[PDB]
Design a protein around this ligand. Structure first.
Ligand SMILES: Nc1ncnc2c1ncn2[C@@H]1O[C@H](COP(=O)(O)OP(=O)(O)OP(=O)(O)O)[C@@H](O)[C@H]1O
Ligand SMILES: Nc1ncnc2c1ncn2[C@@H]1O[C@H](COP(=O)(O)OP(=O)(O)OP(=O)(O)O)[C@@H](O)[C@H]1O
Ligand SMILES: Nc1ncnc2c1ncn2[C@@H]1O[C@H](COP(=O)(O)OP(=O)(O)O)[C@@H](O)[C@H]1O
Ligand SMILES: [Mg+2]
Ligand SMILES: [Mg+2]
Ligand SMILES: [Mg+2]
Lengths: 15, 102, 520, 438, 114, 478, 52
């Protein structure tokens, strides 16, 4: 699940 | 095991000689009759003890420097990286298939 | 000092005393008269422990040969080391002592296969545990066999009807491919496999003998009460006469759990080698990989990623490659595999999950987020692939399956825009509600397999807007109203002709106009 | 006594090696150490191959010399079972540790036994009402099944199991066995005083009228003892199921401590470690325990096994292996316990096989599935409520947010045992009333 | 089948050979003969180089080592115990374990000689 | 016995056939050791101290007995290391008795229910998360949030109470500094001797320079020295400073013995390491002496990481949990107790009854203030019902501040709490409450504090007199 | 991701590289088109955060 937290980080940074 | 009970065998302690007297005359023709199935002993030379994945562990080589270009009898060179207590672990510059055990 | 070279010993072996004692105990003068244990065909246990026995002797044993201890429990000789044999134990290792005798049997591992295996709740070794006696009409074949080659196969043509609407339209399964049901814990995987078994009971009484499908369910690592409930369920539906229950549960020993899908594949390959059709579900294949991990780690093999061995890809590869559609020169049989891999909180990038996804053709990703949205079965329609595609899809279902895939593809990207209630577009709203119609169309209760013709009619009635007038919340019963209120002739000719003909698509176009929908 | 009297060869922590001159004991048999301060019972786990067994010690090995004679009992660890054990506290070797004289023993049963076979299994589905709303709504407990209370380190799985004892264990009629596997010693003393004050444990000569047997190997005990106290509680419950033939309860506290004790032992047996640091034989040891806790044709064992998760990690292999052995699962979460909700049952991860429309009725099933649907549609919008706010949602979404916020508070419930520290009196809810309320 | 018990237990894989040697030579009551023979072999390893070459060199084949240890120990009144011991220890290259099998044998005999 | 090899914190010792598993051996260089791994061919010995003084061939003598520290009433006031050798420089330990560090905790039948409180003198913890005697209360926090200050004020208040009570109820503290700096232990010993708390405290210090088994064994040495007081009918208090450092030292010990590491490279028995230790803090029954021992494990998390391995280990062992948030510490609120996470399981059944009936409304108002502050961060609307309890919770969090090293007796805690929760400190500006409660304790008659310590319950006469006295208070802000 | 959108063959246009993309070896008439397609696609993925 250590890719999903990176994608969530990228979505939160884009937001 | 200790060393204290193992150093004390350096002094002779047989108190009989019915084995070391007779076979000391038999051992030399016994090693003469298997002269063909030997290999000449290496002290300052080096004999390949094993080889694998481009790494040959070389028995012998009593005076290599750590990092010295060793050269196999196949013509391929090597580099003595780690020096173990009994053998030398060298690397293989190229084809490892031209290096056999021996 | 000249004595220092012989100071510390350089052993080429570990059980050196066991080789010395085979030559010093005859040096006693009174012990030359057959006072020697033979090790040519026998073997003495050196060290027992954790279901692993290391046996000295066994000079003529083969790798993978089933040996028998003198305690009665059997074992498989797995590691043939230079001075001993590492023998796994097929049972409790409490009955084994140091010094026990190991009698090899000369046989690589054998399981009883045949027509008498139907309905028999057996282990991964062949003993039935259902209490109906031994296996009678059987024959003893090998467990590990060579997979069929490139000549021995033909193209996957005929479909294997599942009975689940979320998979028979979107992720179609042909008779002879390997379809994985991957998900999380309590997401619907075993239920999809059980629906795939029960639909074979609903189907086999309508097809001839050459087209029947004999299921084999391989419960590896499950509870004993789960397999008891499943045997009770398959007997309550009457599908036990088509089903073999291979069961190495969690109480059973680790090599039994390791060999259960191999034993089941050997029991299901009998129908493949005799022109019949077979369907095997290696349920909880991750627990089989865990059992192989334990059996290898106690056998001193170097571990890799997640402490699995290296050849655990080969473990599932040589198991799954025995599922194929044979050519007409070899009988035309088929075996359709259904592995089940459990993920942990959606990490699909694990080791065993990526290996089984890399092996199998299809994949059915059941997600635990869409399970609690009411969408049961919880099929994530985006990630699920079926690499036979429309080559083995049911005709008639192929006429609407492209529309279903495209409309659900637009509905999957209309998300993250429906949370703004005033933001009407009147075109994304149409596909947004159409996706809700199609999503709530594909719901099913469990243990209720629908025949394929009723599935095609029910999804035809939703992809063409004949349930578009109802609300989003009453499509679970309007589906049943559409199934019941049409003529029974429509399913009767749609099952027989093979496709929605132009001589039928005007009949049921009008039969959906004489229906009563509970909403307008 | 030259033969059948072995000597201690080597000691590595809680792992003792005995070397014999002849007749090594069978594996899983009990040994006794001569001349130790306490009665130290070893248990053979391996055969090392040089006439040497590798034993797990059921007490401390502090003070073992490598010359101490060790006798063989020729049997496994055998505990006193029967009706006379009702109202006693036992350790892992069957001694009373409540100081009430010896244990009145009908039979002396060993703790190592085979699981009941496939044909001896019973397939029955009847509900067990517990009075909690989330359990009786979303994951109803099977009467004669297995129940796991996951969640770890202060979520309330030990309070919840006392509430389950207080609710079910007095209105049951059959016996009860509490097996404390590696929980606090203080909690065992609290339960002992609370079961004396409630009347399910009696002292004196009227001990036999009690309905609960305690088996404690609590967290002060060495890892040899914590790996075997669950098996002793299983032997005590299996005498009532197999011989007395009547339905029991078996509340095992912190069954993670069994796996952890076997992992502490299997670090020193020289086995190669599996995933994150556990033993390789996790699944087989846990199966050989957990398949003995089963309802057969003659009796029933209704078990509520609290399962501690490590560092709140459900992908840890020690609870993820345990997930396969349970009928009804009650996962507790700390993200809901930090919202003040109690009991902190995660409603979208706690499942059961009883939640089926054929068993509990289509009304209860459809209410539970609607509740799960409302909570899941709330959980999908949590980031939108977080960053964008409640003031831009749809009408239906900000109605489901209010309905979900009402049912999240409504799933919380004051407990009959928790009022010692919270003041609110506990409310035992009936089944049809909470179904009608939801 | 019926071996007399050693007076003191010992360690593994080099002391086990000494335990078996004391057990076998105590069945034959040659307990001080084989100690003298092992002492003679220790000093025989000390004397010549062609015998310690049979225990330190890793390029000697096992066939010539087995045939040398048999054809040397054929004669001179050697015990059957020491002959079969040296045959089994030369077949597996364990001739370098002689120096620490004889010490554990001396500890065993010192336990027995009381 | 001879030494075969030394390195990586172990001494492979030849011989010692008569040694016991866990026997304190003593090298020829004076440095002690423990016979940990009794192998078949050697004896593994960990070195209690620096192993740079040990060679191959050094002699290892056994002491005849298990690893033991001198315990008893002569240790009171003496700064010891992990084996009880005094390093304070005031001679050897007189009036003492050696006993083992590794003992079994007393069983189920030996403990009794906690009845009496352990007053810590910090009014935040004793008003919100109250502690009885025989309670394991984990002080878990971040780095530099004031855990050690809470423990120090607990010890100093034990000193202050010890002269106002009879001999039969006196608390003898034990401080166990594992992994702390030597400078910090020096400041703490200077504080404990200049306030007079070294009359009742032992300082078991294994600092960060010391070897790893010394930091491993120092909590067991402290627990033995406090189990002297627990076993003989007296009472004990023990503070394990930074058990995270003790678990890191045991991780170093385990990874230097080639043991398989588990989660976060910890060994398999790091739960058993802390369960062997924190389970000896008991409240014995009336047969065994009626003694007590109260533990306070200190755990340093990283970023509020309550879900770490060692944090969730020591949470599952202890009875309570005190979580000290850094976002309340950096906003001036000291001590920075997190009431949404801090809880005492033993709690209200064994606390001060006046505080039991004055602080239920205090935690109720703080619960409603948490409900308000969870929603009123934005400044949207003022509904005049959330705003009133917002001001009440602001006044209560300002009331629950405290200056360091100043423990307040329990009557002056409950009088200030009663003056805060009944509305008498209302309409005061919130930056002046720290003078207001000081003036309230100063101006109410000391007869009120005397009778409130005496009877231990707010009588119907006492609150009727106390309301009328709190009307007569020169409060700032008017 | 491009296979999720139904575009097959699911070649990623911003990770596919070649040594034949040098403007000497294919000329300007192919390299300018390839570079423009890459530029508008990468700008579209950059703008895809706000248009979604
Ligand atoms: N079509 C359906 N309608 C309603 N409920 C369903 C449907 N399919 C499955 N379920 C429910 O979902 C659950 C699925 O459990 P399943 O048999 O998948 O266990 P599993 O995920 O294979 O393994 P584990 O028990 O380890 O999680 C069942 O309890 C069943 O009640
Ligand atoms: N009640 C208080 N009033 C004022 N200052 C305080 C109070 N409590 C703690 N502090 C301040 O907090 C700082 C750190 O406190 P303390 O030394 O107790 O933390 P700690 O737990 O030792 O942290 P660490 O163990 O990481 O050093 C000190 O400088 C001290 O002045
Ligand atoms: N129903 C409940 N109501 C209020 N608090 C609870 C409840 N259940 C648990 N708690 C809190 O949890 C704490 C103890 O949890 P516990 O049951 O010990 O879990 P664990 O054994 O995993 O630590 C108690 O102090 C209590 O305050
Ligand atoms: Mg399942
Ligand atoms: Mg608990
Ligand atoms: Mg500190």
């Amino acid at each position: 699940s250590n890719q999903a937290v990176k994608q969530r980080i990228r979505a939160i940074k884009n937001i | 095991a200790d060393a204290k009970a193992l150093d004390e065998l350096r002094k002779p302690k047989f108190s009989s000689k019915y084995l070391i007297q007779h076979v000391s005359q038999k051992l030399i023709p016994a090693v003469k009759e298997w002269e063909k199935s030997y290999q000449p002993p290496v002290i300052h030379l080096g004999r390949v003890l094993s080889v694998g994945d481009g790494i040959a562990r070389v028995y012998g080589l009593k005076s290599v420097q750590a990092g010295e270009l060793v050269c196999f009898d196949s013509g391929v060179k090597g580099m003595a990286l780690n020096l173990q207590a009994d053998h030398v672990g060298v690397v293989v510059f190229g084809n490892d298939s031209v290096i056999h055990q021996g | 000092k000249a004595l220092d070279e012989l100071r510390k010993p350089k052993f080429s072996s570990k059980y050196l005393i066991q080789h010395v004692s085979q030559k010093l105990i005859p040096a006693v003068k009174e012990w030359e008269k057959s006072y020697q244990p033979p090790v040519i065909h026998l073997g003495r246990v050196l060290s027992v422990g954790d279901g692993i026995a290391r046996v000295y002797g066994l000079k003529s044993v083969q790798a993978g040969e089933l040996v028998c201890f003198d305690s009665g429990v059997k074992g498989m000789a797995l590691n043939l080391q230079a001075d001993h044999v590492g023998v796994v134990v097929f049972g409790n290792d409490s009955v084994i002592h140091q010094g026990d005798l190991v009698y090899r049997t000369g046989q690589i591992v054998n399981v009883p296969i045949g027509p008498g295996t139907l309905g028999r709740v057996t282990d991964g070794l062949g003993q039935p545990i259902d209490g109906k006696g031994p296996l009678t009409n059987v024959r003893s074949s090998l467990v590990e066999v060579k997979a069929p080659g490139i000549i021995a196969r033909q193209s996957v043509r005929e479909p294997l009807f599942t009975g689940v609407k979320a998979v028979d339209a979107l992720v179609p399964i042909g008779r002879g491919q390997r379809e994985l049901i991957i998900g999380d814990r309590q997401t619907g995987k075993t239920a999809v496999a059980i629906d795939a078994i029960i639909h074979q009971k609903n189907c086999n009484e309508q097809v001839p003998k050459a087209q029947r499908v004999y299921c084999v369910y391989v419960a590896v690592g499950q509870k004993r009460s789960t397999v008891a409930q499943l045997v009770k369920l398959f007997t309550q539906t009457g599908a036990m006469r088509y089903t073999i229950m291979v069961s190495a549960t969690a109480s059973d020993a680790a090599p039994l759990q390791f060999l259960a899908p191999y034993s089941g594949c050997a029991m299901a390959e009998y129908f493949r080698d005799t022109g019949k059709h077979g369907l095997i579900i290696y349920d909880d294949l991750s627990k089989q990989s865990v059992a192989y991990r334990q059996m290898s780690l106690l056998l001193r093999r170097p571990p890799g990623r997640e402490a699995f061995p290296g050849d655990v890809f080969y473990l599932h590869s040589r198991l799954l490659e025995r599922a194929a559609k044979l050519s007409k020169e070899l009988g035309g049989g088929s075996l359709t595999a259904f592995p089940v891999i459990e993920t942990q909180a959606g990490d699909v990038s694990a080791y065993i999950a990526t290996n089984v996804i890399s092996i199998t053709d299809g994949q059915i990703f059941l997600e635990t987020e869409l399970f609690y949205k009411g969408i049961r079965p919880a099929l994530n329609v985006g990630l699920s692939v079926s690499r036979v595609g429309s080559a083995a899809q049911f005709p008639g279902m192929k006429q609407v399956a492209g529309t279903l895939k495209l409309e659900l593809a637009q509905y999957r990207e209309v998300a993250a825009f429906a949370q703004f209630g005033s933001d009407l577009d009147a075109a994304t709203q149409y596909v947004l509600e159409r996706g809700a119609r199609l999503t709530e169309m594909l719901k099913q209760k469990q243990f209720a397999p629908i025949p394929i013709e009723r599935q095609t009619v029910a999804v035809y009635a939703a992809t063409k807007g004949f349930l578009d007038k109802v609300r989003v919340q009453d499509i679970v019963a309007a589906e049943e109203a559409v199934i019941s209120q049409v003529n029974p002739a429509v399913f009767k000719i749609l099952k027989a002709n093979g496709k929605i003909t132009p001589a039928l698509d005007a009949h049921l176009k009008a039969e959906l106009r004489k229906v009563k929908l509970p909403g307008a | 006594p030259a033969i059948d009297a072995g000597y201690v060869s080597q000691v590595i922590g809680p792992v003792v090696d005995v070397r014999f001159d002849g007749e090594l004991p069978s594996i899983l048999s009990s040994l006794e150490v001569e001349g130790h301060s306490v009665r130290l019972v070893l248990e053979v786990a391996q055969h090392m191959g040089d006439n040497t067994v590798r034993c797990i010690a059921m007490d401390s090995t502090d003070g073992l010399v490598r010359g101490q004679k060790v006798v063989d009992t020729g049997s496994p660890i055998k505990v006193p079972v029967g009706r006379g054990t009702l109202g006693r506290i036992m350790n892992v070797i069957g001694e009373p540790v409540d100081e009430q004289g010896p244990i009145d023993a009908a039979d002396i049963w060993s703790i190592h036994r085979e699981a009941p076979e496939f044909t001896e299994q019973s397939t029955e589905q009847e509900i067990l009402v517990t009075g909690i709303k989330v359990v009786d709504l979303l994951a109803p407990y099977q009467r004669g099944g297995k129940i796991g209370l996951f969640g770890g380190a202060g979520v309330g799985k030990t309070v919840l199991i006392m509430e389950l004892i207080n609710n079910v264990a007095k209105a049951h009629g059959g016996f009860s066995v509490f097996a404390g596997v590696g929980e606090r010693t203080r909690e065992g003393n609290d339960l002992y005083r609370e079961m004396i004050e409630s009347g399910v444990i009696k002292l004196g000569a009227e001990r036999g009228n009690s309905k609960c047997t305690l088996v404690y190997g609590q967290m002060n005990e060495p890892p040899g003892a914590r790996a075997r106290v669950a098996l002793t509680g299983l032997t005590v419950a299996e005498y009532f199921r197999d011989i007395e033939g009547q339905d029991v309860l078996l509340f095992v506290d912190n069954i993670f401590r069994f796996t952890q004790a076997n992992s502490e032992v299997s670090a020193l047996l020289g086995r190669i470690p599996s995933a994150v640091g556990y033993q390789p034989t996790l699944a087989t040891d846990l199966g050989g325990l957990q398949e003995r806790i089963t309802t057969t044709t003659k009796g029933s064992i209704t078990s509520v096994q609290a399962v501690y998760v490590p560092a709140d990690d459900l992908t840890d292999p020690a609870p993820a292996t345990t997930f396969a052995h349970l009928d009804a699962t009650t996962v507790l979460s700390r993200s809901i316990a930090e919202l003040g909700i109690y009991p902190a049952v995660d409603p979208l991860d706690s499942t059961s096989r009883m939640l089926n429309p054929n068993v509990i009725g289509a009304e209860h099933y459809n209410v539970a599935r609607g509740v799960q649907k409302v909570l899941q549609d709330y959980k999908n919008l949590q980031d939108i409520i977080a960053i964008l706010g409640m003031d831009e949602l749809s009408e239906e979404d900000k109605l489901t947010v209010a309905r979900a916020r009402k049912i999240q508070r409504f799933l919380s419930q004051p407990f009959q045992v928790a009022e010692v520290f919270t003041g609110t009196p506990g409310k035992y809810v009936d089944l049809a009333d909470t179904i009608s309320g939801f | 089948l019926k071996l007399p018990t050693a007076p003191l237990q010992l360690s593994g894989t080099s002391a086990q050979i000494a335990t078996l040697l004391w057990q076998v030579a105590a069945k034959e009551n040659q307990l001080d003969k084989v100690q003298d023979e092992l002492y003679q072999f220790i000093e025989l390893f000390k004397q010549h180089s062609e015998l310690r070459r049979l225990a330190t060199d890793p390029f000697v084949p096992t066939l010539v080592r087995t045939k040398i240890i048999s054809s040397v120990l054929k004669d001179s009144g050697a015990s059957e115990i020491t002959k079969k011991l040296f045959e089994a220890l030369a077949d597996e290259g364990a001739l370098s374990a002689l120096l620490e099998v004889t010490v554990n044998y001396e500890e065993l005999m010192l336990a027995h000689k009381k």
